Amino acid sequence: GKFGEHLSKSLIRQYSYYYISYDDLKTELEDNLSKNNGQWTQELETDFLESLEIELDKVYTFCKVKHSEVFRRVKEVQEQVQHTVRLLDSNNPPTQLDFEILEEELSDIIADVHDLAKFSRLNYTGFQKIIKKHDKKTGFILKPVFQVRLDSKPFFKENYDELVVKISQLYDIARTSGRPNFVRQTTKYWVHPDNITELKLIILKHLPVLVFNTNKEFEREDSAITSIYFDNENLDLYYGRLRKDEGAEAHRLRWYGGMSTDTIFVERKTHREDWTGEKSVKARFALKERHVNDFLKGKYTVDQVFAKMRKEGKKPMNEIENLEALASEIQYVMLKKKLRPVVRSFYNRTAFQLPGDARVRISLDTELTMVREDNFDGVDRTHKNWRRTDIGVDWPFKQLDDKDICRFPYAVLEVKLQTQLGQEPPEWVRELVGSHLVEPVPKFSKFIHGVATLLNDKVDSIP
């Protein structure tokens, strides 16, 4: 009534005529009743139902025009945006200037959808308010009669749910300026044993030494990386890795820290030639030391190996089945190729990294040593074991015969960068790498070096 006409004055500026004539209908109700001394008739009702059907048809059609008009701008931009995306890969590319315009046009449609929605709703509220006022002031029933007429001609039933979702989808393309990060680097350097400490102290200031929670304080023992490499009498695996053969496997049994360590890593490296397009892999499974000799024989089955892991329930069966397939393959090769402990690789690793920072990550391998594990010269070193027991991690292994050990003259410094595009690596790294402490050099194999050095007499190809 009064609150309905006062709020009606808050209509959209541009559209004043297209809007409901509430005042004109409120006058028709009060003027006809005053004339008939507060009484409504069959004649007055049919004439008032005419006025309402005139305004309903006026609104329904305008809204059927503006609805198609705003849907036109949508079709036009949906098309232009879909073609812009196609042009991202083609010879003619779309610059950032293009997306700025597309966004500008969407913002304009957003304004229109808003105005269309505000109008449809304001009008429907008016019709509801006028029918409610008529049925009150007269004893005539018009609410369910007129509802049939409103439902047959809906402008208010517009969901906009799909339009809004589409506008956001299109706007996101303009926001993401198309269809929608750093650079890695790994360098190895030789370090002369005179600089191991100086270099360690330098790195220390910037990056802390990575210490694993060893259930006890640090001991030199805790940095030892011992790896027993396997090959046969004919040194098949060595030649394969040496000639960089496609699919060339290298088998090694690794343990971290001192002799107290019971968890042994059964590792395998598969070489993949660049022509395949596939990268080389490294795969491993953990094994208790008390089971190693028995496993390599075939006596300790793969199903026995992983029985505890299956029962533990921590790992998904898919992963377990892959680890089982791995162990099975490693077990097959050891037997079929008659592999035996051939050469031991030892070195101490000091890692340097800031927690949750990968911009710079350094590692230093020191006391690089290759020891004989074979029986190719008649001398049984292992004594039917997977490693010799006359040595531990007790470098420089003085007890060993001079011809069984190769104490490598240098240390290896590995610098792993992850530099975000546009930015540079820290100046401290650039200064260190360019200093008298490190020498530039490419990666080498401790297995190949060990076999070629210690088994010089057995090998024909020496790099």
CSV table of C-alpha atoms in Angstrom, one decimal, residues 231-236 238-239 340 342 372 374-378 403 451-462:
chain,number,residue,atom,x,y,z
A,231,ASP,CA,78.5,-58.1,-10.3
A,232,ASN,CA,79.5,-61.6,-11.6
A,233,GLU,CA,82.8,-63.3,-12.6
A,234,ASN,CA,82.5,-62.0,-16.2
A,235,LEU,CA,81.8,-58.5,-14.8
A,236,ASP,CA,78.6,-58.2,-17.0
A,238,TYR,CA,80.2,-53.3,-15.0
A,239,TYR,CA,80.6,-53.3,-18.8
A,340,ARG,CA,78.4,-61.7,-5.8
A,342,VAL,CA,82.5,-57.3,-5.9
A,372,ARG,CA,87.5,-55.2,-2.8
A,374,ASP,CA,85.3,-60.1,-4.6
A,375,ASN,CA,87.1,-63.6,-4.6
A,376,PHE,CA,88.3,-63.2,-8.3
A,377,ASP,CA,92.0,-63.5,-7.2
A,378,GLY,CA,91.4,-66.7,-5.2
A,403,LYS,CA,95.9,-53.6,-3.4
A,451,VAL,CA,86.3,-52.1,-10.5
A,452,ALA,CA,88.7,-50.4,-13.0
A,453,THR,CA,91.1,-49.5,-10.2
A,454,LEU,CA,91.1,-52.6,-7.9
A,455,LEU,CA,90.3,-55.2,-10.6
A,456,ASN,CA,92.6,-53.6,-13.3
A,457,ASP,CA,94.0,-57.1,-14.3
A,458,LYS,CA,90.5,-58.5,-14.9
A,459,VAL,CA,89.1,-55.5,-17.0
A,460,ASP,CA,89.9,-54.7,-20.6
A,461,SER,CA,88.0,-51.3,-20.9
A,462,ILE,CA,89.5,-48.7,-18.5
